[PDB]
Every structure is written in structure tokens, then in C-alpha cells.
């Protein structure tokens, strides 16, 4: 059979639904999203470290002269200083390269395109549970043993990332690194390299060779800090700790694990051997409801009693039909005379909902009270509504006041018609 | 090092957490809604921090412990089942940008109704009296 | 805890000491025997 609903994307909140077709006992359905990550398609421009500039032993002629050009290396300053060491000449070329170790401490200036959505859905139907994983696009069927699940396109697409990003040791930064081959010195991206192991480093480093003046042979250079070394001081907080929906970011392929946004539309395709006919479900006549606590808003602040009357000893399957209360445990082992309980979970001051035990639909009227606990470890299992989060007595006051502000106007227009048509 | 586990006080729509360390730890927060609004600080010594939690609130971590999430509930002082001085104290204290609006609209509706009734009954005494 | 008046006693030598210090024992996890804990500071020293 084919049923179609809209799960809300908040992970590890279960979601109750009945699927009922005619001539068959309504069976239960729970669809908990247990994991969800969006994976974007990434490709890396370059790779950065600190330079440890090759500071070679310099080339010195005692009476001859040197005219040293560039070999195929990075930034030099292959500079050829004149009369020195009392002409004599020194051609110092302190050319940058990678550090002594970039396999341990480097960066990957990754560019990021648009992203996917997986899920990890757990679906319980009848007496069977099913663990699967389904791409959240409206076409790809993630299947269990026997049921085919698709998941519609998201209500609203969202990314915690941006276009340009930087991966350090483990962490992720929304920073705007310069393009390939068009860098500036001092800042991040002095050295560029298409990988750690390849050739062709391209550097603008603000290295500055200085003319030596000492009694012994050395080579004096000054430099800025490596832009990697200065970015290691200038960086704020990674994207683990500022991501806008409470999602956590682990990276071998740069995914955004366990977000919470929008709502997936599911469209399931239930097998045909899980149903059972109404010639084998127990009947139920005459439900009634005492209602107990009704502390609203919390987790499971509600009790009621279903007073029922059946024929066999089976298992029925309970579901609230309105949206302003959502119960728990979804099946009841009924008996012939009995009174087993439920657990309402509203977040509005009026438990005013509709329960069907095995198909026999009744109502629950009550009044809910605000909780006395201010802050709690569990997210809200409902959303508020106008015309449902407003108590009845306040509707009576508003209608009394605003309708007495208009009944005298109706009496005024009857004064119009009476005084104008009699005269 | 693991820092010394703080001590929290759950108020209405906020938490307060007394903290007491002696080597500098790092306190980091965010709100889990649409606007994250982050915050980070290094603290030493003994201090008290206040943070307004909303309905979709507030994961804080503090000095390399595992994180801890916190959600706020819809308490308030009052009852929506009571006299009108107990209901308005429950709604204005939770949504002040609506309660004053509907009160102004109701009083202006009363004034409008009584004004048009007062002018039309005087018209009726005028024009029905030659 | 962490303020003035953490330890209390009715004289210098009387009994019935009284104390809050937010002392928290912790699970030992090592190769040799130790008993670990954490604790708020001496709130008499944070008045001096
Ligand atoms: C963000 C969704 C909004 C759902 C809550 C809306 C609440 C409206 C509350 C208005 C307050 C009405 C209280 C009026 C009391 C009348 C007593 C004379």
C-alpha cells in the first residue's frame, strides 16, 4: 500500500502515524531520523605550510665575480652582493621550500559546491523494524528487505559552509583564501602547492635578503612571519563551534553531521503482508477518558485512561488525530474489560484532542497547567500555534469584550432603520 | 587538565553558572536557532555568567569537557485559567509585543462602538422630532 | 562555597565543623593507585 507524509527533521525525535486502508486494522508507523549529514562536493586548490627557507652555504668568490640567475625553485632572493669580506663577492640565495614536516601540519584550501542530504531512517511498521539510509532527493529508493522509501526534496536548503573553506589538522574555517597563483605576502597563502609531494611551488613570501656585515661568513635575511604561522594566531573559532543549527563537523570527506532544519517529505510503500483484516482485529465499543496531570510543554506531561470494551485479547494501536497532542507507545494490549493508560504530550494549554483506540474515535477534553521547572535536557516535541496556544477563558473574555463592542453597533444600525423608516 | 565542573542556576529564560578555576579556561557558547550568536572568553578565578536561553537554546562548553545542551521551557508566573489579572501576567511576561497590541485593539473597539452609538441615538432624537 | 565562611566552628577547639567546598571525587584511571578530586578554592583566601 502507498502512504505519504512529512517527517520533521529533528534527529532522534520519533514520529507517530497510522496508515489505514479499508477492511483492515489500522497498523502503526514510527519513522525516527537517527542521523543526517549533508556532504558537499569539494575540490582543493593548493596546500600551505611554513617555509623553512633553504638557507644554503653561500657562494663566495675571493677575487672573481658571480652572476647567479634562478634555477627552477621557489621564491629566491638570489642576490649577488658586492664588495664584502675584506673584490670578493657573495651570491646568497635563500630560497623558500616547504618546512621539515608538512605531512603533519599543513592546510588544504578546499572549495565547496552545493551539498546533498542523506538520512539514516529507522522505520517501525507492525512488528518489524527496519534500518536503512536514503538520499534525500525525490527519486532514489532506499529500501529495506521489502519496503521502498523515497524522501522528497527539503523544504528549505541550508549550508553551514560557504564557498571557500580551510581545513587545518581537524578543524574547519570559513575564510577567504586568495586564488591560485595570485597571492600576497604576509597573509595566508604564501607558498602554494597542488599537493605535498608534487613539484612547482609558487611563492611570494616577503623574504628580504640583507647585505652581510660581520667578521665571519653568514647570510642575513629578514622575513615576515609565514602567513600560515600568522594565520595560526589570527584565526577565530572553527566551524565546529559557530555552525548555525547545532551541527557538528567531522572531516574525512567534509560533512556537516546532525543538523536540524526543515522537514523531509517521505513517501513510503508498505508491504502487503503486514496488514490484517478487521475480521481478525478485536472490536472496540464505547471509549471514555479520565484525564490526569496535564503539565504541558515538557516531554511527556500528560496521563489519561482509556476505558474500553473489546472481544478478544489482542493488540490494538493508538493514535491521536489532532496535531496539538502527540501520544506515546502507539500500541495497547487490550482485554475485554479494562482501563489501560496513555501519555499525552501537548505544548498548549488545552488538551482538546481526538484518540482512536482500534478505530473507534473519541475525544479528550482537559485543561493544562504551566510547568514548574525552568530548563530541561530535552527538545520540544511540538510547535506552538495561534488559536491553539490561547486558553478558552481568554477566548471567552476576548469574544465578550470585542463582541459587546459590536452588539451595540448592531443596535445602532437597527436605530438607523427604525428611526428612518417610521419617522 | 579537566577543569572544575561549574554550578548552574536555572532561572526563567536564562541560566547562571558560577565558575571557579585558577588556570585560564575557555568558555564557548552558541544558540541553536537560526541566529547562532557565538561568544568565547577566557576566565580565571571566580565569576558568575548569565545567559538568556530561548525555546531552541544554548549549547555551552567550558574548558575541554564534553559539550552540554540545554533547552528552556514555557514557564511563567500566573495562570491562563483565572481572573484577568492572572492571565495578562502570563502572556505579557512571555509575549509583550502581542498582549499590549490586543489590549489596545479591544479598548479602541469599545470606544468606537460607544461613540457611534452615542452619536446615532442623538441623531435619532433629532430627526424623529419635528 | 568560595566565599567567606566556608569552614565554621564555635571555637578554635570545639567540634562540629561545618563545610561546603564543592568537593567532587573522580574516577581513577591510571596505572598506579591514586584518588583524584576537584574542589572550589579557599574562600577565606579570596577575602584576604
Ligand atoms: C510565534 C507563534 C505565536 C503563537 C503564540 C501567539 C500568542 C498570542 C498571545 C497573545 C496574548 C493574548 C492574551 C490576551 C489575554 C486577554 C485577556 C483579557
DSSP labels for A192-217?
A: E-SSSSSS--EE---EEE----SSS-
Distances (CA, A) of A106 to A99, A210, B103: 10, 29, 63
Q: H or E stretch including B25?
A: strand B14-30
d(CA B69, CA B31): 10
Q: Check if the beta carbon of residue B75 is closer than 8 Å to that of residue B94.
A: no
B5: contact with C, CB 8 A cutoff: yes
* Residue nearest ligand 1's atom 16 by CA: A394
* A180 three-state secondary structure: coil
Say yes or no for a CB contact (<8 Å) between A246 and B90: no
CA B22 from chain center: how many Å? 34
Residues with their C more than 2.5 Å from the N of the next written residue in chain A, i.e. before a break, are 86
A157: contact with B, CB 8 A cutoff: no
d(CA A52, CA A50): 6
Nearest of A46, A110, A99 to residue A229 by alpha carbon? A99
Say yes or no for a CB contact (<8 Å) between C2 and B5: no
Q: Check if the beta carbon of residue B94 is closer than 8 Å to that of residue B76.
A: yes
C24: contact with B, CB 8 A cutoff: yes
- Spell out which residues of chain C touch residue B46, defining contact as CB-CB under 8 Å: 2, 41, 46
Contacts of B7 (CB under 8 A, 6+ apart): B17, B18, B19, C22
d(CA A58, CA A221): 12
B88 CA closest ligand 1 atom index: 15
- Which of B99, B103, B105 maximizes ligand 1 atoms within 8 Å of its Cβ, making it the mutation to test the pocket? B99
Say yes or no for a CB contact (<8 Å) between A372 and B75: yes
Are there at least 3 beta-carbon pairs closer than 8 Å between A and B?
yes
d(CA A134, CA A140): 7
Report which DSSP code applies to A57: P
Q: Check if the beta carbon of residue A284 is closer than 8 Å to that of residue A357.
A: yes
Number of Cβ atoms within 10 Å of the Cβ of A211:
12
Expt. technique: cryo-EM
B4: contact with C, CB 8 A cutoff: yes
C25: contact with B, CB 8 A cutoff: no
- Spell out which residues of chain B touch residue C46, defining contact as CB-CB under 8 Å: 46
Q: Check if the beta carbon of residue A268 is closer than 8 Å to that of residue A121.
A: no
Q: Which residue of A has its CA nearest to B11?
A: A374
* A393 three-state secondary structure: helix
Contacts of B among chains (3+ CB pairs under 8 A):
A, C
Strands (E), A295-392: 304-309, 319-320, 337-338, 341-342, 352-356, 361-365, 375-376
Burial class (CB in 10 A: 0-12, 13-18, 19+), B17: middle
Opening angle at CA A29, ends A24 and A34, nearest 5: 165
d(CA A96, CA A203): 8
d(CA B83, CA A391): 12
Distances (CA, A) of A286 to A1, A317, A359: 30, 16, 11
Amino acid at each position: 500500500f502507498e502512504h505519504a507524509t512529512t517527517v520533521p527533521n529533528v534527529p532522534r525525535i520519533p514520529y507517530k502515524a497510522l496508515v489505514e486502508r479499508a477492511g483492515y486494522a489500522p497498523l502503526n508507523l514510527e519513522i525516527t531520523v537517527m542521523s543526517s549529514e549533508l556532504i558537499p562536493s569539494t575540490n582543493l586548490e593548493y596546500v600551505t605550510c611554513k617555509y623553512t627557507t633553504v638557507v644554503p652555504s653561500p657562494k663566495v668568490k675571493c677575487c672573481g665575480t658571480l652572476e647567479c640567475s634562478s634555477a627552477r625553485h621557489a621564491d629566491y632572493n638570489c642576490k649577488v652582493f658586492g664588495g664584502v669580506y675584506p673584490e670578493n663577492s657573495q651570491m646568497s640565495e635563500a630560497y623558500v621550500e616547504f618546512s621539515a614536516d608538512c605531512a603533519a601540519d599543513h592546510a588544504q584550501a578546499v572549495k565547496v559546491h552545493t551539498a546533498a542530504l542523506k538520512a539514516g531512517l529507522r522505520i517501525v511498521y507492525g512488528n518489524t523494524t527496519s534500518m536503512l539510509d536514503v538520499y534525500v532527493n525525490g527519486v532514489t529508493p532506499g529500501t529495506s528487505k521489502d519496503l521502498k522509501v523515497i524522501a522528497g526534496p527539503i523544504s528549505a536548503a541550508y549550508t553551514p559552509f560557504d564557498h571557500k573553506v580551510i581545513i587545518h589538522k581537524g578543524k574547519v574555517y570559513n575564510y577567504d583564501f586568495p586564488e591560485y597563483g595570485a597571492m600576497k605576502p604576509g597573509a595566508f597563502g604564501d607558498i602554494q602547492a597542488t599537493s605535498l609531494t608534487s613539484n612547482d611551488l609558487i611563492a611570494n613570501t616577503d623574504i628580504r635578503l640583507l647585505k652581510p656585515s660581520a667578521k665571519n661568513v653568514h647570510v642575513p635575511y629578514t622575513q615576515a612571519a609565514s602567513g600560515f604561522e600568522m594565520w595560526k594566531n589570527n584565526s577565530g573559532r572553527p566551524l565546529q563551534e559557530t555552525a548555525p543549527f547545532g551541527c557538528q563537523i567531522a572531516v574525512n570527506p567534509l560533512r556537516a553531521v546532525d543538523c536540524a532544519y526543515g522537514n523531509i517529505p517521505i513517501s513510503l510503500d508498505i508491504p502487503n503482508a503486514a496488514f490484517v483484516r478487521v475480521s481478525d482485529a478485536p472490536l472496540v465499543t464505547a471509549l471514555k477518558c479520565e484525564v490526569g496531570e496535564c503539565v504541558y510543554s515538557a516531554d511527556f506531561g500528560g496521563i489519561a485512561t482509556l476505558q474500553y470494551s473489546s472481544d478478544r485479547e489482542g493488540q490494538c494501536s493508538v493514535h491521536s488525530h489532532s496535531s496539538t497532542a502527540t501520544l506515546q507507545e502507539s500500541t495497547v494490549h487490550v482485554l475485554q474489560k479494562g482501563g489501560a493508560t496513555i501519555h499525552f504530550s501537548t505544548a498548549s494549554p488545552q488538551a482538546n484532542f481526538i484518540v482512536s483506540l482500534c478505530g473507534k474515535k473519541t475525544t479528550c477534553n482537559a485543561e493544562c497547567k504551566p510547568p514548574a521547572d525552568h530548563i530541561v535536557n530535552v527538545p520540544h516535541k511540538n510547535d506552538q500555534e495561534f488559536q491553539a496556544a490561547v486558553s478558552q477563558t481568554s477566548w471567552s473574555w476576548l469574544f465578550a469584550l470585542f463582541g459587546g463592542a459590536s452588539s451595540l453597533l448592531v443596535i445602532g444600525v437597527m436605530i438607523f432603520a427604525c428611526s428612518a423608516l417610521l419617522t | 587538565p579537566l577543569a572544575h565542573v561549574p554550578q548552574v542556576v536555572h532561572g526563567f529564560k536564562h541560566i547562571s553558572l558560577q565558575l571557579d578555576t585558577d588556570h585560564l579556561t575557555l568558555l564557548t557558547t552558541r544558540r541553536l536557532g537560526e541566529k547562532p550568536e557565538p561568544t568565547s572568553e577566557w576566565i580565571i578565578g571566580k565569576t558568575v555568567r548569565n545567559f538568556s536561553v530561548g525555546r531552541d537554546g544554548f549549547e555551552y562548553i567550558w574548558g575541554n569537557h564534553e559539550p552540554v545542551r540545554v533547552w528552556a521551557q514555557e514557564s511563567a508566573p500566573g495562570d491562563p485559567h483565572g481572573w484577568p489579572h492572572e492571565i495578562v501576567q502570563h502572556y505579557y511576561h512571555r509575549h509583550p509585543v502581542y498582549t499590549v497590541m490586543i489590549l489596545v485593539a479591544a479598548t479602541l473597539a469599545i470606544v468606537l462602538g460607544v461613540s457611534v452609538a452615542s452619536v446615532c441615538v442623538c441623531r435619532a432624537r433629532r430627526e424623529c422630532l419635528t
